[PDB]
Design an enzyme around this catalytic site. Structure first.
Site, PDB file in Angstrom:
ATOM      1  N   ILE A 187       0.839  -1.191   0.000  1.00 12.13           N
ATOM      2  CA  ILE A 187       0.000   0.000   0.000  1.00 12.13           C
ATOM      3  C   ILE A 187       0.877   1.244   0.000  1.00 12.13           C
ATOM      4  O   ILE A 187       1.784   1.371   0.814  1.00 12.13           O
ATOM      5  CB  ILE A 187      -0.984   0.012   1.224  1.00 12.13           C
ATOM      6  CG1 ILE A 187      -2.001  -1.125   1.062  1.00 12.13           C
ATOM      7  CG2 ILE A 187      -1.699   1.391   1.334  1.00 12.13           C
ATOM      8  CD1 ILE A 187      -2.947  -1.332   2.211  1.00 12.13           C
TER       9      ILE A 187
ATOM     10  N   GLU B 274      -2.010  -8.485   3.116  1.00 12.48           N
ATOM     11  CA  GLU B 274      -1.647  -9.738   3.764  1.00 12.48           C
ATOM     12  C   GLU B 274      -2.644 -10.856   3.502  1.00 12.48           C
ATOM     13  O   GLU B 274      -2.254 -12.014   3.274  1.00 12.48           O
ATOM     14  CB  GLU B 274      -1.454  -9.533   5.267  1.00 12.48           C
ATOM     15  CG  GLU B 274      -0.437  -8.450   5.607  1.00 12.48           C
ATOM     16  CD  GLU B 274       1.023  -8.851   5.360  1.00 12.48           C
ATOM     17  OE1 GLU B 274       1.318  -9.675   4.476  1.00 12.48           O
ATOM     18  OE2 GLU B 274       1.911  -8.236   5.965  1.00 12.48           O
TER      19      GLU B 274
ATOM     20  N   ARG C  17      -1.765 -12.248   0.111  1.00 11.46           N
ATOM     21  CA  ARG C  17      -0.559 -13.086   0.107  1.00 11.46           C
ATOM     22  C   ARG C  17      -0.785 -14.517   0.620  1.00 11.46           C
ATOM     23  O   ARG C  17      -0.094 -15.440   0.197  1.00 11.46           O
ATOM     24  CB  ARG C  17       0.550 -12.402   0.928  1.00 11.46           C
ATOM     25  CG  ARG C  17       1.053 -11.099   0.296  1.00 11.46           C
ATOM     26  CD  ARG C  17       1.838 -10.235   1.283  1.00 11.46           C
ATOM     27  NE  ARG C  17       2.375  -9.018   0.651  1.00 11.46           N
ATOM     28  CZ  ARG C  17       2.505  -7.846   1.278  1.00 11.46           C
ATOM     29  NH1 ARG C  17       2.137  -7.729   2.556  1.00 11.46           N
ATOM     30  NH2 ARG C  17       2.936  -6.770   0.625  1.00 11.46           N
TER      31      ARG C  17
END
Length: 247
Positions: free
Chosen positions: A71, A160, A163
């Protein structure tokens, strides 16, 4: 662009959102069926906007670098906010150009800075969909002193979750309640770069890591990960950071 609306959100709609977010990211290869992200993209290709709307129908737009899912900054109305780092200032050349106000935040986007700024470690900050609503409200009505904690919820709920399937599932589960992230979540967050690097090496090394990665599992025990048959590789990690973004 990708959008997520918290009003009427469910576990399903969050998963849909995280899927679309992953699909937004360009990859040339898959290693072991996992998308390998690109090493370098020109500015006009490098950034993706995701729009997030809270229960009160207040919207922020967040800029992410598609090569590392970082970000860069966000926009709320006519004001943009960027992290105080070199990649964020590059980002500012391409996104939110029509914003009337641009503010540079007093910290970069890395956890050690953010946790220091927030005065709270990641394990003590609630996640879950109601937590994401609260973060959007806090960033929309920017208060310097709450921003860091809100940015950590935002990062964990988007980057996250993108991911790792386990983090996606753990956050998506909490629709009407919040939860404190375990050390399993924190160690996955800590270890993305290392895992990515070793998986790329493994593909040249008969599926074996050159250097182990120590993770903490859902029973809180330190486990040593050494190859691509481990569950974190087969069933969890969902994007690979290109080795050229490791240094």
């Amino acid at each position: 662009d990708v959008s997520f609306r918290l009003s009427g959100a469910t576990s399903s709609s969050y998963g849909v959102f995280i899927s679309n977010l992953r699909k937004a990211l360009p990859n040339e290869r898959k290693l072991y069926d996992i998308p390998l992200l690109r090493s370098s993209l020109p500015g006009s290709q490098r950034y993706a906007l995701i729009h997030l709307t809270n229960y009160a129908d207040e919207t922020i737009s967040v800029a992410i670098d598609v090569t590392n899912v970082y970000i860069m900054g966000y926009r709320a109305g006519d004001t943009s906010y960027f992290f105080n780092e070199a990649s964020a200032t590059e980002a500012a050349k391409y996104v939110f150009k029509d914003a009337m106000r641009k503010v540079t935040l007093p910290y970069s986007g890395n956890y050690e800075r953010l946790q220091t700024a927030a005065g709270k470690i990641r394990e003590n900050i609630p996640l879950g969909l109601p937590a994401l609503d609260s973060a959007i409200t806090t960033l929309f009505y920017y208060n310097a002193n709450s921003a860091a904690s809100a940015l950590m919820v935002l990062i964990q709920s988007t980057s996250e979750a993108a991911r790792y399937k386990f983090i996606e599932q753990q956050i998506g589960k909490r629709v009407d309640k919040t939860f404190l992230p375990s050390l399993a979540i924190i160690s996955l967050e800590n270890s993305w770069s290392a895992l990515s690097k070793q998986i790329q090496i493994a593909s040249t090394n008969n599926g074996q890591f050159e250097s182990p990665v120590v993770l903490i599992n859902a029973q809180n025990q330190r486990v040593t990960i050494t190859n691509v048959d481990a569950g974190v590789v087969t069933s969890n990690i969902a994007l690979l950071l290109n080795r050229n973004n490791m240094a």
